Amino acid sequence: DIPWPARTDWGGHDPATPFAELMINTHSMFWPVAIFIYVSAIYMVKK
């Protein structure tokens, strides 16, 4: 509904429509893949 202080709200917050829920879950679905892509690559940044 309205922004609240010091909230991460990663991927969205307070959906009030089925489409709004879809948007939040699409981001949540891809987020672990993004973490994998980052962690897997960064771990090899070294001599």
Binding site: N25, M29, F30
Partner: protein
């Protein structure tokens, strides 16, 4: 890849072969000034670019991307009801454009749309079937999928019969609850 100029290079016949490439590689080249030097530079380029295994991966990617691109362009021109190349219908008012209106419904129901819409229950927790029923008939009635979308949907069970709350979150149970209160029709 031979290392001696005496040993010939095999070429197929056609429009993209080793012989076809040799004929055209040095057309604009100031460095291929004699047969020996020209052949050495030609084989140097062929060895570097065509005998490089990873280079073939990019060849696949350009073909796939370009094929999709050409086809999406063609599809718009050939089928999209809103793209006009002929002028007969554009010389008439909107109510009279019957030939162009014929593209509308067939274009509104592509195969992949019918195949993938049932899988909305892998993205929506509450009332994933909220928009399934439509009495008009421009589109097919939608039935929710029985399985999660293959891939990265580990958060939901592989099959929805496994989920305990799935049936209680349906637009039908929600309608029952709200209709019992007199709250709303849907």
């Amino acid at each position: 890849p031979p290392t001696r100029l005496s040993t010939p290079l095999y070429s197929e016949g056609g429009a993209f072969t080793v012989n076809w490439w040799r004929n055209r590689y040095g057309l604009y080249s100031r460095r291929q000034t004699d047969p020996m030097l020209a052949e050495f530079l030609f084989r140097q380029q062929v060895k570097e670019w065509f005998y490089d295994v990873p280079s073939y991966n990019y060849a696949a990617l350009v073909g796939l991307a370009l094929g999709i691109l050409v086809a999406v362009i063609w599809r718009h021109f050939l089928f999209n009801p809103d793209v006009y190349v002929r002028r007969q219908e554009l010389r008439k008012m909107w109510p009279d454009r019957h030939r162009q209106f014929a593209y509308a419904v067939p274009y509104l129901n592509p195969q992949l749309k019918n195949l993938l819409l049932p899988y909305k229950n892998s993205f929506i927790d509450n009332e994933p079937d909220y928009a399934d029923y439509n009495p008009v008939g421009l589109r097919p009635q939608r039935v929710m999928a029985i399985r999660r979308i293959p891939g990265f949907f580990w958060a939901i069970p592989q099959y929805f019969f496994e989920d305990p709350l799935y049936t209680s979150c349906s637009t039908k149970n929600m309608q029952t609850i709200y209709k019992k209160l007199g709250y709303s029709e849907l």
